[PDB]
Amino acid sequence: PHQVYNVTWTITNLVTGTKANATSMLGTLTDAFPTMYFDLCDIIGNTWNPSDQEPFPGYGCDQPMRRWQQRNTPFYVCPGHANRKQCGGPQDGFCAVWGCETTGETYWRPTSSWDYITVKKGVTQGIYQCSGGGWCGPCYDKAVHSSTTGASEGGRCNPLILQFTQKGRQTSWDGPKSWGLRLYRSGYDPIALFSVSRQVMTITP
């Protein structure tokens, strides 16, 4: 009865244009606001991964330990849909100055009363010593070294969870909205850009 349409929400890698993930559900524009799930490594761009000449940088999506150390690093998120000059643009992840963040996971627990979403780390076993002392866990790509237990495809172990806020559930979604995500480190804070958009189509069969 309330299932008038098939609403699909998509999280997009801003730079590459690829789909980090998607979720569909039946309902209306006012009640279809599902919880989204995606991995950080599916939204990074060409300039995120540290160079190969760079010794144990502490983050990155191209190597298991890089992915693991990245997982244990805090991060903050800034909206790029509000046109706040002081926060800068995509090249700053919309976080040019402190106070631009509206969510994420850091010691000061950023939240917001005006932004449309919240983003927190999901659950993962990441990496752990198992049985024979070797390293086991999802951070390892099962398609790069099978046998290594826990190994997931892609080596995904940076799950993020996105939820819509009350303000988010009440704002208009005509056109995509973008956000920037930054790792909070003692040194450069790498930038990852993503977008959220909605499609509304008829049900089938």
Ligand X SMILES: *[C@@H]1O[C@H](CO)[C@@H](O[C@@H]2O[C@H](CO)[C@@H](O)[C@H](O)[C@H]2NC(C)=O)[C@H](O)[C@H]1NC(C)=O
Cβ atoms of 78 and 84 within 8 Å: the answer is: no
Is residue 156 at the binding interface for ligand X, with CB under 6 A as the rule?
A: yes
Phi first, then psi, for residue 166 (nearest 5°) are: -55, -45
Give the C-alpha distances (Å, rounded to integers) separating 135 from 55, 96, 132, 139: 20, 38, 9, 10
Cβ atoms of 5 and 26 within 8 Å: the answer is: yes
Cβ atoms of 189 and 180 within 8 Å: the answer is: no
- How many residues bind ligand X (CB under 6 A)? The answer is 12
Is residue 39 at the binding interface for ligand X, with CB under 6 A as the rule?
A: yes
Binding-site member from 9, 33, 38, 116 for ligand X (CB under 6 A): 38
User: With respect to ligand X, which residue has the nearer C-beta, 24 or 72?
Assistant: 24
Cβ atoms of 183 and 104 within 8 Å: the answer is: no
Residue 52: which of 39, 66, 42, 41 has the closest Cα?
66
Tell me how far, at minimum, the Cβ of 36 lies from ligand X, in Å.
Answer: 7
Binding-site member from 51, 53, 147, 204 for ligand X (CB under 6 A): 204
Number of residue whose CB is nearest ligand X: 6
Which positions from 174 through 203 interact with ligand X, judged by CB under 6 A?
A: 201
User: With respect to ligand X, which residue has the nearer C-beta, 123 or 134?
Assistant: 123
User: With respect to ligand X, which residue has the nearer C-beta, 35 or 91?
Assistant: 35
Tell me how far, at minimum, the Cβ of 201 lies from ligand X, in Å.
Answer: 5
Is residue 115 at the binding interface for ligand X, with CB under 6 A as the rule?
A: no
For the chain, the 3-state helix, strand and coil shares in percent, each to the nearest 5, are 10, 30, 55
Question: Quick one: tokens of 106?
Answer: 């850091």
Tell me how far, at minimum, the Cβ of 40 lies from ligand X, in Å.
Answer: 10
Is residue 113 at the binding interface for ligand X, with CB under 6 A as the rule?
A: no
Which positions from 8 through 37 interact with ligand X, judged by CB under 6 A?
A: 8, 21, 23-24, 37
Q: Is the peptide bond before 205 cis (omega within 30 degrees of 0)?
A: yes
Is residue 6 at the binding interface for ligand X, with CB under 6 A as the rule?
A: yes
User: How many C-beta atoms lie closer than 10 Å to residue 173's C-beta?
Assistant: 17
Point out which residues bind ligand X (CB under 6 A).
6, 8, 21, 23-24, 37-39, 156, 159, 201, 204
